[PDB]
A paper describes a structure:
The enzyme inorganic pyrophosphatase (PPase) catalyzes the hydrolysis of pyrophosphate (PPi) to inorganic phosphate (Pi). This is an exergonic reaction and can be coupled to several unfavorable and energy demanding biochemical transformations such as DNA replication, protein synthesis and lipid metabolism. Family I PPases are Mg2+ dependent enzymes known to exist as homo-hexamers in prokaryotes and dimers in eukaryotes. We report structural and biochemical characterization of these two apicomplexan PPases.
The TgPPase crystal structure was refined to 2.35 Å and showed the same structural overall fold as PfPPase. However, TgPPase lacked both N- and C-terminal regions and the structure contains residues 74–308, most likely due to proteolysis of N-terminal region during crystallization. In contrast to PfPPase, the active site of TgPPase contained two bound Mg2+ ions. One Mg2+ was bound at M1 site coordinated by Asp190, Asp195 and Asp227. The Mg2+ was bound to protein in M2 site predominantly through water molecules and Asp195. However, no electron density for either Pi or PPi was observed in the TgPPase active site despite addition of PPi during crystallization. Therefore, it is feasible that the observed conformation in the active site represents a state where both Pis have already dissociated. Like PfPPase, TgPPase also formed dimers in solution and in the crystal. Two TgPPase subunits buried 1780 Å2 (50%) of total ASA and are held together mainly by a network hydrogen bonds and Van der Waal forces. On the other hand, TgPPase monomers are joined by α3 only.
Numbering used by the authors:
A (entry chain B): 74 to 305
B (entry chain A): 74 to 308
Write the structure that this text describes.
Amino acid sequence: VYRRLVSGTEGEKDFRVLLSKKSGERLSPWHDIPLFPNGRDARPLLFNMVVEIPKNTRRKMEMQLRLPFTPIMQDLKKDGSLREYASTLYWNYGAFPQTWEDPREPGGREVFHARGDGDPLDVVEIGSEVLPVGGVVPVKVLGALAMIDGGELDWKVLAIREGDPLFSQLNSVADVERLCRGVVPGIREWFRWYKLPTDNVVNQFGHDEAALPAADAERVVYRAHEHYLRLL
Amino acid sequence: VYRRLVSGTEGEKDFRVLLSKKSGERLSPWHDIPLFPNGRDARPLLFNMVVEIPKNTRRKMEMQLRLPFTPIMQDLKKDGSLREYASTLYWNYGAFPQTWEDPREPGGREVFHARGDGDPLDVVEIGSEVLPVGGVVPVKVLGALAMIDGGELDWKVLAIREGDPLFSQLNSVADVERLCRGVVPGIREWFRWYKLPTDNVVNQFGHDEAALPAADAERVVYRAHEHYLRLLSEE
Ligand SMILES: [Mg+2]
Ligand SMILES: [Mg+2]
Ligand SMILES: [Mg+2]
Ligand SMILES: [Mg+2]
């Protein structure tokens, strides 16, 4: 469905992934990829996921929202070096197109009244297959962890790629805990601890650290989608 | 108190940490450091921990058991390049002196009948302060996770450094869960997942993934201590 135009070498400053339709026409993975690849009336409801960080990698790849067509490149520190996480991420990681965590909207106290992180909504894909930088895959939402990253509400939605062998068997948080041991706590503990070496901070999680159910996590995506639509 | 003799350059193949008494006499952190710094009858019971990997680092530093005085150096790949873990370890990590997880000794059915890892018993220290490579600190044992790494039983004993502010307040897993949220699951999930990028394997845990209580973890250390001592025995 979407074409990856890869340039440079993956570990260097010239690396960049650009997206185009199969017509050849360039398009933004954030603006012009539909959030619902088969409409809002599909059941099970599928969301598009733009993969930024592949499973088993450590480079902080992200869509460059300032640039035309929002290409994916590695984040830079102010020292101008390519930025990496202190630990390898064990799952495909990215964001939902056409979503925005509006900082102007305050959460209840289940999330310590934290505010939107200001970025496209983050999603963790738990499938076995390694997905490439700039990949776009339809996913089924399974749940969501409400991370609090320095006073900011930073949702991590959990999803499973359509076509993964266990897709039809995973429909809720309990199914993941049952058929994929360590995935839910591994993701929670990864994002709780990953900024200890860089910032000496241990993050918190709202809703008593629980993974909110799939239906509630779908509503989180909807709200971020409308915040995005309201932005335009 | 033991003296650290640091040699080579950090992060390079020549880096090496050796231990000596305050006499200057060199000694092996595995062979010549007592497991019980105040004897087995000390209350609270203290075990000595040889710190190999400091909190918030990822180089795979380990005691080199083949070398004289068993110095701590960075592990090597078959390529001969320096080996690092794929992820940063968020806690001080090392081993108990005079312990050996004797293989050939079969585990119960709670550990999938897995055998010993063949190495000195591993310990995770959960205190806040970063400890140096080659540091020797007395710790109080709080619990143990029974990680299974490819048919090998690889215990991760959890302990707290004497002198850490929460020392007197931490005596078992339940205290850690109460006063240090995320420490026990953070350690379990770290060792469950850390070899996925290198080996494409997700580790398992015996005893239904539970953190065994402090008393059970004390017995884990004792048994490994006896395995080591048996290697030294006559007749
Ligand atoms: Mg993001
Ligand atoms: Mg976010
Ligand atoms: Mg070890
Ligand atoms: Mg071991």
